């Protein structure tokens, strides 16, 4: 039937939040936060005040979700009243955010009704004396994602001038900064903190298990009659949440104890619904939740236990042999020569007490040695893998490290998985299990 195919499509676009903006789901634990964001936007767009504020919470804490919700709800009532500027501390720099404001200023002002052209000292002084300076004004709303990278230790020019428009400009300038850092005010300079209006509002957190039950209840309830299966779906999902010993309420409880983030459970429900062929299987799959065990097995199937279980016998024997040399060493370090010496005296002691097991040569374990390097079982000794930013990754590419230049079998390595962890994962029926203990 096409009724189920329309029952999937709404129930899946409720799980992405792409409902139109009067049907969008606002959970009850972040209503008092979105009412505080609602008050700030519409006494700056309707009532033309100029205050700034920083939103702060973790990643995937509905900071950009609530700002996109509040502007879209003011989009439909007050379209002509405001232009919106949004920057982002990842893709913008100190130099590039000047071009990003002026490009978005001139293209938002065409839709209601040049600035962006010239040198960078020209394009910055034109957006100043535009902004710094019965008919009413256009209010300009700024949105910052990762304002904490604009609040670096060095200069902080761009945060100085925008907070200087909150205090002194005759243009009403609303500024949202979405950061993650709890100590965001200590990144700011003394001049930049003094201009800022000191309002830093903290995104709410899930406090109870019943907050996640009510928020999954709001995500999986269809509030209109689109399909013949809507009432039959809604009475199934209310039985699965009223029963505390149900399997769906068991997977919510594991999320509350481990992740406590509803977007992580949201990625689990999405292929439980989209990979359901008919309503008979879609009603069954949320009763049993046998997909969420298969999903959670996949997400964690090549982390470090799933890579150790995908090894051959020589790859496991070299991994054990390098884990015994790393336990005797004081620095946890080993070579290819040290780990093949422990390997060959292990294969001797197997074949002496015992048909026989092949001892692979020095030239043949070299391929096994390099695969354990690229599967993150061995790391280079004092190694800095990825750098923080782009200049530190560029400085490291011009330096020629020592372990590159020394020969192959002399490189000191270290150990991702120690021998005491390596005894616990390998089963007791392996012939190499006796060698996971000194």
């Amino acid at each position: 039937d096409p009724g189920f195919g329309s029952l999937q499509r709404r129930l899946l676009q409720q799980l992405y939040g792409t409902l139109p903006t009067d049907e969008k789901i606002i959970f009850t634990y972040l209503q008092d936060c979105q009412q505080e964001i609602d008050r700030i936007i519409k006494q700056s767009i309707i009532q033309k005040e100029s205050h700034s504020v920083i939103l702060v919470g973790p990643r995937q804490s509905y900071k950009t979700y609530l700002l996109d919700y509040e502007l879209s709800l003011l989009q439909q009532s007050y379209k002509e009243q405001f232009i919106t500027i949004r920057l982002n501390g990842f893709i913008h720099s100190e130099q590039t955010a000047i071009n990003g404001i002026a490009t978005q200023l001139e293209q938002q002002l065409q839709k209601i009704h040049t600035i962006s052209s010239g040198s960078l000292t020209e394009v910055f002084e034109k957006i100043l004396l535009l902004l710094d300076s019965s008919i009413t004004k256009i209010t300009v709303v700024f949105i910052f994602d990762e304002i904490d990278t604009f609040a670096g230790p060095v200069r902080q020019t761009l945060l100085y001038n925008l907070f200087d428009m909150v205090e002194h400009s005759r243009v009403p300038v609303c500024i949202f900064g979405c950061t993650t850092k709890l100590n965001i005010l200590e990144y700011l300079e003394k001049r930049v903190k003094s201009r800022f209006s000191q309002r830093v509002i903290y995104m709410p957190q899930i406090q109870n298990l019943d907050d996640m039950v009510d928020a999954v209840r709001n995500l999986l309830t269809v509030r209109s009659e689109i399909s013949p299966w809507v009432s039959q779906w809604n009475e199934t999902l209310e039985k699965e949440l009223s029963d505390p010993r149900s399997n769906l309420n068991r997977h919510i409880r594991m999320n509350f104890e481990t992740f406590r983030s509803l977007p992580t459970l949201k990625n689990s429900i999405i292929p439980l619904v989209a990979t359901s062929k008919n309503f008979g299987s879609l009603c069954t799959a949320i009763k049993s939740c046998s997909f969420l065990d298969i999903y959670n097995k996949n997400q964690l199937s090549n982390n470090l236990t799933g890579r150790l279980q995908s090894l051959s016998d020589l790859e496991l024997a070299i991994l054990i042999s390098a884990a015994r040399v790393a336990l005797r060493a004081k620095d946890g370090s080993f070579n290819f020569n040290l780990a093949y010496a422990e390997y060959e005296k292990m294969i001797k002691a197997i074949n002496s007490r015992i048909n026989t097991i092949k001892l692979w040569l020095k030239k043949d374990v070299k391929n096994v040695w390099e695969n354990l390097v690229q599967l993150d079982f061995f790391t280079e000794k004092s190694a800095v893998g990825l750098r923080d930013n782009a200049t530190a990754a560029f400085y490291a590419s011009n330096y020629q490290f020592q372990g590159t230049m020394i020969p192959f079998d002399l490189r000191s390595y270290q150990m991702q998985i120690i021998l005491q962890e390596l005894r616990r994962i390998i089963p007791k029926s392996n012939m190499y299990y006796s060698w996971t203990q000194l």
């Binding site: 195919g5 499509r9 899946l12 676009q13 992405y16 792409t18 973790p58 990643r59 995937q60 950009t64 996109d68 949004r86 982002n88 990842f90 893709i91 913008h92 720099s93 590039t96 990003g100 490009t103 994602d145 983030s261 977007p263 992580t264 949201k266 990625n267 999405i270 292929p271 989209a274 990979t275 298969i294 996949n298 997400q299 964690l300 199937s301 090549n302 982390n303 890579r307 995908s310 090894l311 051959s312 020589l314 790859e315 092949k358 692979w360 043949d364 391929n367 695969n371 690229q374 599967l375 993150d376 990825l386 750098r387 923080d388 930013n389 782009a390 530190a392 990754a393 560029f394 590419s397």
Partner: protein
């Protein structure tokens, strides 16, 4: 949905999730998606086999290993997106923007904003999949570059007719765990078994081991002309089962090391 799931051999969970996230409707598709697996785990195979079984949803295939720095990676995005849309919609009048003019992560956003507004006469919402195939294999890679591509969706216009969608492919799972709190969906491609490597290697290579001239030349020239295709297929299949059972402990669960030891030892 309204999509076709192909039959990849030992990736039947991975293809059902791949059909679950990738669709033509942009409202029910995530703007980021990672396909993580290690080398040889069949994740460009089933990514390609999914898009061939679904021809009416559109893909731009980029390899970030032959682009080496972050700046050629931005320029190739601007080049191949507008080259895709010209073949895809020839009736739309457009003015070509120089892809070599982007030198910033923002100048990509401004160029993609300029490319997408002139396809505004299209009839419905359409998603173009920008497949960064091997994003972790970029040589100059750092921690602060992948969270610069997560957030491009928020800087591009929300009511455009063309919604770019990023599909990432990456290897090493220590790169992936740096971005765990972004909660963007990930499909894992674990390593194959010894029985999964042998079945894949025997359906991939028994075709070439017949059309190889060395087996072709010898059977007529040795003057033993008493054979069929079903013996031809079984003599090459039993070599592959014998070249694995000897050298599995040396190679491991590779595909590319087994493919080299076949053709070095088949003549």
């Amino acid at each position: 949905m309204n999509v076709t799931t192909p039959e990849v051999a030992f990736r039947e969970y991975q293809t059902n999730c791949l059909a679950s996230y990738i669709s033509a409707d942009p409202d029910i598709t995530p703007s980021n998606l990672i396909l993580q697996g290690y080398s040889g785990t069949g994740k460009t195979y089933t990514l390609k086999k999914y898009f061939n079984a679904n021809p009416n949803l559109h893909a731009v295939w980029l390899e970030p290993v032959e682009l080496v720095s972050w700046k050629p990676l931005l320029q190739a995005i601007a080049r191949t997106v507008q080259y895709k849309l010209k073949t895809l919609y020839p009736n739309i009048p457009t003015t070509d923007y120089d892809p070599l003019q982007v030198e910033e992560p923002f100048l990509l956003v401004k160029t993609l904003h300029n490319i997408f507004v002139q396809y505004e006469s299209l009839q419905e919402k359409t998603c173009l999949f920008l497949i960064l195939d091997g994003f972790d294999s970029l040589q100059d890679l750092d921690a602060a570059l992948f969270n610069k591509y997560i957030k491009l969706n928020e800087l591009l216009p929300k009511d455009s007719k063309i919604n770019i969608k990023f599909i990432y492919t990456m290897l090493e799972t220590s790169f992936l765990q740096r971005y765990s709190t972004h909660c963007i969906p990930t499909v894992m491609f674990p390593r194959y078994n010894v029985d999964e490597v042998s079945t894949i290697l025997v359906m991939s290579r028994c075709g070439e081991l017949m059309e190889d001239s060395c087996l072709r030349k010898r059977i007529i020239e040795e003057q033993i002309t008493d054979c069929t295709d079903d013996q031809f297929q079984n003599v090459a299949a039993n070599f592959i089962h014998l070249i694995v059972q000897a050298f599995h402990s040396y190679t491991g669960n590779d595909i590319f090391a087994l493919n080299d030891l076949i053709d070095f030892k088949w003549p």
